[PDB]
Design a protein around this ligand. Structure first.
Ligand SMILES: Nc1nc2c(ncn2[C@@H]2O[C@H](COP(=O)(O)OP(=O)(O)OP(=O)(O)O)[C@@H](O)[C@H]2O)c(=O)[nH]1
Ligand SMILES: Nc1ncnc2c1ncn2[C@@H]1O[C@H](COP(=O)(O)OP(=O)(O)CP(=O)(O)O)[C@@H](O)[C@H]1O
Ligand SMILES: Nc1nc2c(ncn2[C@@H]2O[C@H](COP(=O)(O)OP(=O)(O)O)[C@@H](O)[C@H]2O)c(=O)[nH]1
Ligand SMILES: CCc1noc(C)c1C(=O)Nc1cc(C)on1
Ligand SMILES: CCc1noc(C)c1C(=O)Nc1cc(C)on1
Ligand SMILES: CCc1noc(C)c1C(=O)Nc1cc(C)on1
Ligand SMILES: [Ca+2]
Ligand SMILES: [Ca+2]
Ligand SMILES: [Ca+2]
Ligand SMILES: [Mg+2]
Ligand SMILES: [Mg+2]
Ligand SMILES: [Mg+2]
Lengths: 438, 425, 54, 352
């Protein structure tokens, strides 16, 4: 057994982190006080769920998590929330004033003064690991902390944990649920400095999660609670292999191996199905083929884009529930003769499949209805580059006038770092086009 | 605990400031004695933003009252909520400022500024984490304009990285006390361009026309004009005083509304505005239609004459947040020619469940529009009409000022107009 | 349409289906960046105080 | 109040649509770089589909199908036909074609020479035509040596297909011609065939013993009006519409345009568009697409119809701009943005 340390930075990461650890507990039968009756090895053991939970002599299962925010309002909810007993105070780190949606502020002005403390708290959790694999880092692109502080933390983690893997769960900025116009700056600044430090990043576009909540859950005005309970379902589907018995994606290393043949192109597209409104009278349960086919619909992708006009470098199918290999292969053969699935010539044309028999757990009172089987597809498509294009374009509109740039230079950042980050994105976009277009 | 320190200076500043504390004290359930008597926990959640908590569960506003004569502040202390203010926080002289910027900034004001800062320093030392300062004042007088801007210059020196916001009443010949208001306003505008993060430009002519044309008040008074400023100040600060919409931060709001450091002068708005047909229910479309109509604009500037750099709208009341988005998108997607297209999504909307007193719902408008240059153009043309004959200068040269200082104020604001012009094309 | 590497356990199974064959900065360098930005803040604030002293 | 942008100043078609929309008083045009638009009349090359459908509260519609170039490219169309089981390689309505890359750059050089050597031995007609999408540059020759040597001198991909040695000729004149059919596909993938077509006729007598003079062999409007000396003799601008052409087929051949030619045309249009529907459909997409297509057909003396190419940015006949452009507003634009007949189109029903 090898441990994984989760790190939640900023409001987005903390709130999402809260929704995921709630789900992890309900999936592993861990109660709010940390007790786990099913665990027969008291105060120890090297089980699959121990990759995310340590154990105390008192039988408490403590997440291997750290929460970091430059302002205490969001982390304060965790300290007094339903699962306040899972964590101890050392795990929840809060400042007094935030980065004000300013990358430079979270990276330089305030980041420089708190980085050495965060690292010390992470070291404490690492000291409890007999074979640490790496880190899962949750954060937003738009926040000054989610973007500015994360990139600094990622730089230092590479310095203090050279051979460890680092995966991201990054929230792509969507204006519909955003009250800040400078988020395109922060996103491109943080993607520039984080790129060489992240082995695999899962981008979730709030726009996609928003319309899935309106379309499938009939939520007219989705809240962050709605969005985060949905995101944590997808996150749970991606990390299940690390927490349960199995042979696919058993360690963080296997993610880059199976999803990222080229290092810079480490942004797999995620697609999840089915998402059924729990308020529905009672839905007809979908088959293996119906949910598998749904993985090639744009309406359930975490990032809206057209995979038909890209090229695949890898494709993973992660099933949960009543699923046998025979039905998977039957649906795949049917999707090939119907769908547009163009792989890159230097990659094989295949699918790695993982099946966990336990169907998705639903949060009591949540929005999602219980289903007999679900699937999450992880596919590395060049079509996800569309999202970079949209984002790079907004950056160019503002930066051409240097709008809001003074707020960044005022925190010690040099203006040139803007263009230095933008040029990097221009290279990232060119890399996708060389891989997907003819 | 993100505290704000409030300062009100001069006649206009203290009368408008007083009404502000009168309006929000009623929203947070604070009586004229400082005791709370509301019925909702939301009234106390963000209460420490503008109020210090004293013994006995008393809430004393975090405000400092400044003036160079006693008259006005004597009224506040005798006014409705006069007893609510901290006694030590009344700082005043006896000489007055004679509607003279130089007296407020260099002579009379300078004699009194140090003691005013001792109170500001005292209020900040108790803040768990000081967010920033807000000042209410007029630019046409002598104390609020001359000494007000002196206070800002010294506050920035001592707190260089805290946010400095002002609500500034701009003079107008139609609602004028003396002919030198253009002089005092032009000298203050330069101080504001340098040393404030946000300035809410309030034009007394716009306030007058609203009282006359819209509210149908035959003979408006300063008190009538101050009712509007009251409601507007409560609107723009609603997101700071009540929970729900995070990112409610002074610097965060400045970061998103000010794309360029010197262009930080906002046009405020408010809806509804009804004369006494006052009980009619107001729909969301009507709210949005009015909130964007120029007649509800308080800067006496036609937005259709320029372009919006950034817009922030705060809706108050129990309403369909879904229908809000629909109507806001309708205003933009039906007039996108008045928003600069090089700032994507430069219109943001926030909702608030608690409505103001006596209103089922309301909307407050906060616009960073390049049409605000029309306001500085008015003041500049009035300045030049007198300065070209050196009329009334002796009131200032007698306090130690030179003509050169006027010429540079002139050039500084004409430059400010040039900056707004290049971003309009 | 070949199935390979079939692994089965109590909590599920996993396999691979092949349809078609194919055809950093040191700790010192980081501190310098963090200290350079702080030096540009100090220089900008000094000029702001120098301006206020005039 | 609907809003649209214009990003193709060279489109004679959507220049009229933009004119008609403004006339409705319910559509307002914006600068070409304004994202808050309902309708984009986009550029030809490198249309940024990836930025569409991401503006909150705006249903956005564009006048091009992403991925339709597969059908509107000389080389792409040949590859689409030979590889799509829907069309198969034995497709009976598409001339035997081969994709040939110049030797300075898969490629079907030998496969073409095998079929060529077979014809040259079987005493059959062995006349081919080489062409490419980078032309105003066409060559018609009966010797395979000339066809290959011609492409190698260029630097872009070319396509060699069998030249119809027995094309149907109009009388009087004894002249070649092609038929242009405009087809519109709305956001629902309804295939509409504009009732009005045009025959681009040659004003020069067809001569099968001289492919060197390409004035009587190529029916392009720009060729006849520049290198042909009989331009506009028989019909105005070398453009005969269906009324006259139908009347001719009845007087000479004792048949109608509907039965002898229009059935084959409508069948070809369905097979092509239905073939790529799963690849270009925008039914479940965050934005919506529609596109006007200009098909080109050939007719032989047996009254069999062959497909020449498909144009993704076609122009219309001068006389039919009003009727057609208006039709686009009705079925393609107003269908998504309604305004506060006897359809001019022929819906070709099909299975989605
Ligand atoms: N999905 C999701 N997105 C969130 C959540 N909270 C904030 N966001 C997104 O994050 C972006 C803003 O960044 P934040 O994470 O809130 O800011 P921050 O990281 O705390 O940094 P500061 O600027 O210092 O507050 C916006 O685009 C929001 O839509 C959340 O709980 N769930
Ligand atoms: N295989 C073939 N057999 C007979 N004629 C052919 C032919 N290929 C092309 N042509 C002749 O060439 C003309 C069409 O040329 P083509 O369409 O390939 O060039 P082009 O695309 O530049 C003209 P447009 O796109 O405007 O229709 C027709 O008029 C036809 O007479
Ligand atoms: N809106 C409003 N404006 C005022 C009020 N009192 C004065 N003014 C304006 O303020 C300017 C005079 O400044 P004043 O405050 O009286 O001078 P000060 O006391 O020395 O600061 C003139 O332009 C007046 O129109 C008031 O109560 N309300
Ligand atoms: C809407 C109320 C609000 N609450 O927190 C913030 C931050 C805002 C705000 O106005 N954000 C803006 C405005 C523009 C333009 O870009 N971002
Ligand atoms: C607002 C009342 C007031 N208070 O002090 C002054 C000076 C005024 C004033 O200008 N009154 C006006 C304006 C017009 C027109 O007629 N009367
Ligand atoms: C940026 C416009 C805005 N939009 O929502 C809020 C809240 C504001 C705002 O800045 N309010 C205040 C309060 C004080 C003092 O100064 N500004
Ligand atoms: Ca155990
Ligand atoms: Ca590394
Ligand atoms: Ca004195
Ligand atoms: Mg935050
Ligand atoms: Mg006065
Ligand atoms: Mg062509």
């Amino acid at each position: 057994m090898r441990e994984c340390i989760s790190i939640h930075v900023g409001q987005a990461g903390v709130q999402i982190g809260n929704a995921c650890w709630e789900l992890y507990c309900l999936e592993h039968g861990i109660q709010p006080d940390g007790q786990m009756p099913s665990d027969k090895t008291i105060g120890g053991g090297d089980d699959s769920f121990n990759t995310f939970f340590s154990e105390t002599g008192a039988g408490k299962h403590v997440p291997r998590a750290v929460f970091v925010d430059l302002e205490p309002t969001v982390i304060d909810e965790v300290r007094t929330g339903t699962y306040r007993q899972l964590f101890h105070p050392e795990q929840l780190i809060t400042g007094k004033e935030d980065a004000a949606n300013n990358y430079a502020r979270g990276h330089y002005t305030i980041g420089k003064e708190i980085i050495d403390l965060v690292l010390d708290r992470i070291r404490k959790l690492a000291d409890q690991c007999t074979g640490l694999q790496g880190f899962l880092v949750f954060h937003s692109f738009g926040g000054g902390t989610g973007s500015g502080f994360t990139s600094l933390l990622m730089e230092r983690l590479s310095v203090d944990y050279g051979k460890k893997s680092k995966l991201e769960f990054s929230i792509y900025p969507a204006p519909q649920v955003s009250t800040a116009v400078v988020e395109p700056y922060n996103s491109i600044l943080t993607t520039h400095t984080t790129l060489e430090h992240s082995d695999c990043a899962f981008m979730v576009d709030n726009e996609a999660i928003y319309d899935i909540c309106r379309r499938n859950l009939d939520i007219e005005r989705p809240t962050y609670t709605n969005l985060n309970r949905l995101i944590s379902q997808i996150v749970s589907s991606i990390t299940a292999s690390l927490r349960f018995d199995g042979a696919l994606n058993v360690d963080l290393t296997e993610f880059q191996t199976n999803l990222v043949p080229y290092p810079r192109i480490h942004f797999p597209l995620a697609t999840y199905a089915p998402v059924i409104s729990a308020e529905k009278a009672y839905h007809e349960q979908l088959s293996v083929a119906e949910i598998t086919n749904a993985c090639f619909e744009p309406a359930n992708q975490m990032v809206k884009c057209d995979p038909r006009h890209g090229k695949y470098m890898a494709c993973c199918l992660l099933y949960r529930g009543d699923v046998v290999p025979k039905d998977v292969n039957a649906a795949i053969a049917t999707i090939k003769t119907k769908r547009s699935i163009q792989f890159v010539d230097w990659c094989p044309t295949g699918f790695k499949v993982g099946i966990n028999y336990q169907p998705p757990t639903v949060v009591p009172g949540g929005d999602l209805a219980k289903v007999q089987r679900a699937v999450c597809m992880l596919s590395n498509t060049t079509a996800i580059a569309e999202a970079w294009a949209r984002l790079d374009h907004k950056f160019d509109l503002m930066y051409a006038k240097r709008a809001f740039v003074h707020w960044y230079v005022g925190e010690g950042m040099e203006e040139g770092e803007f263009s230095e980050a933008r040029e990097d994105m221009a290279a990232l976009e060119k890399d996708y086009e060389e891989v997907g277009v003819d | 605990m993100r505290e704000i320190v409030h300062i009100q200076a001069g006649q206009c500043g203290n009368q408008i400031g007083a009404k502000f504390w009168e309006v929000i004290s009623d929203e947070h359930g604070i009586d004229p004695t400082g005791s709370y008597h509301g019925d909702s926990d939301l009234q106390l959640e963000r209460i420490n933003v503008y109020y210090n908590e004293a013994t006995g569960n008393k809430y004393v506003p975090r405000a400092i009252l400044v003036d160079l004569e006693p008259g006005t502040m004597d009224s506040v202390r005798s006014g409705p909520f006069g007893q609510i203010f901290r006694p030590d926080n009344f700082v005043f002289g006896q000489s007055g400022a004679g509607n003279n910027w130089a007296k407020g900034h260099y002579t009379e004001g300078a004699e009194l500024v140090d003691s005013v800062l001792d109170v500001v320093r005292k209020e900040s030392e108790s803040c768990d984490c000081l967010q920033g300062f807000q000042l209410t004042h007029s630019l046409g007088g002598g104390t609020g304009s001359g000494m007000g801007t002196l206070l800002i210059s010294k506050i920035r020196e001592e707190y260089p990285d805290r946010i400095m916001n002002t609500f500034s009443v701009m003079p107008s010949p139609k609602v004028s006390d003396t002919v030198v208001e253009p002089y005092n306003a032009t000298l203050s505008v330069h101080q504001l361009v340098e040393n404030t993060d946000e300035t809410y430009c309030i034009d007394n002519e716009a306030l007058y026309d609203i009282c006359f044309r819209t509210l149908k008040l035959t003979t408006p008074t300063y008190g009538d004009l101050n009712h509007l400023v009251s409601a507007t100040m409560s609107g723009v600060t609603t997101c700071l005083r009540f929970p729900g919409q995070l990112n409610a931060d002074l610097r965060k709001l400045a970061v998103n509304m000010v794309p360029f450091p010197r262009l930080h002068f906002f046009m405020p708005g408010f809806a509804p505005l009804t004369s006494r047909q006052q009980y009619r229910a107001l729909t969301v479309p009507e709210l949005t239609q009015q909130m964007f109509d120029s007649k509800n604009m308080m800067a006496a500037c036609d937005p259709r004459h320029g372009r919006y750099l950034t817009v922030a709208a705060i809706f108050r009341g129990r309403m369909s947040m879904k229908e809000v988005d629909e109507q806001m998108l309708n205003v933009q997607n039906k007039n996108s020619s008045y928003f600069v297209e090089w700032i994507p999504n430069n219109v943001k909307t926030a909702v608030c469940d608690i409505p103001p007193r006596g209103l089922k719902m309301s909307a407050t408008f906060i616009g960073n529009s390049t049409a605000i240059q029309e306001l500085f153009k008015r003041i500049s043309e009035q300045f030049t009409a007198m300065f070209r004959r050196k009329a009334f200068l002796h009131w200032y040269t007698g306090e130690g000022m030179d003509e050169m200082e006027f010429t540079e104020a002139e050039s500084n604001m004409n430059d400010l107009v040039s900056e707004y012009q290049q971003y309009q094309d | 349409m070949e199935v390979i590497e079939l692994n089965k356990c109590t909590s599920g199974q996993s396999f691979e289906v092949i349809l078609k064959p194919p055809s950093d900065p040191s700790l010192e360098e980081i501190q310098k960046k963090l200290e350079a930005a702080e030096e540009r803040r100090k220089y900008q604030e000094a000029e702001l105080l120098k301006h206020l002293a005039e | 109040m609907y809003t649209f942008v214009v990003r193709d100043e060279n489109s004679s078609v959507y220049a009229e649509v933009s004119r008609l929309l403004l006339a409705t008083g319910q559509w307002k045009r914006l600068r070409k770089d304004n994202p808050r638009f309902n309708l984009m009349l986009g550029e030809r090359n490198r249309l940024p589909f990836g930025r569409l459908g991401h503006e909150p509260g705006l249903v956005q519609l564009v006048n091009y199908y992403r991925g339709a170039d597969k059908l509107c490219r000389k080389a792409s169309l040949v590859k689409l036909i030979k590889t799509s089981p829907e069309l198969s390689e034995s497709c009976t309505w598409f001339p035997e074609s081969y994709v040939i890359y110049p030797t300075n750059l898969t490629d079907e050089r030998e496969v073409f020479l095998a079929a060529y050597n077979r014809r040259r031995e079987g005493r059959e007609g062995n006349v081919w035509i080489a062409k490419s999408s980078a032309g105003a540059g066409i060559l018609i020759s009966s010797e395979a040596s000339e066809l290959l040597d011609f492409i190698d001198e260029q630097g872009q991909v070319h396509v060699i297909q069998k030249y119809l040695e027995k094309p149907l000729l109009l009388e009087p004149g004894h002249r070649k011609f092609d038929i242009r059919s405009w087809v519109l596909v709305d956001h629902l993938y309804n295939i509409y065939l504009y009732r009005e077509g045009v025959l681009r006729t040659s004003s020069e007598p067809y001569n099968s013993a001289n492919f060197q003079d390409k004035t009587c062999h190529l029916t392009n409007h720009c060729i006849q009006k520049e290198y042909s000396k009989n331009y506009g003799r028989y019909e105005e601008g070398n453009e005969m519409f269906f009324e006259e052409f139908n009347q001719y087929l009845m007087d000479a051949l004792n048949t109608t345009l509907e039965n002898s030619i229009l059935l084959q045309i409508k069948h070809i249009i369905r097979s092509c568009l239905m073939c790529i529907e799963p690849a270009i459909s925008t039914k479940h997409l965050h934005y919506q697409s529609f596109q006007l297509f200009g098909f080109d057909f050939m007719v032989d003396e047996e009254l069999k119809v062959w497909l020449i190419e498909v144009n993704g940015a076609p122009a219309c006949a001068q006389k039919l701009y009003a009727e057609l452009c208006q039709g686009i507003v009705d079925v393609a634009i107003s269908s998504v943005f309604p305004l506060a007949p006897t359809s001019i189109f022929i819906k070709l029903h099909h299975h989605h």
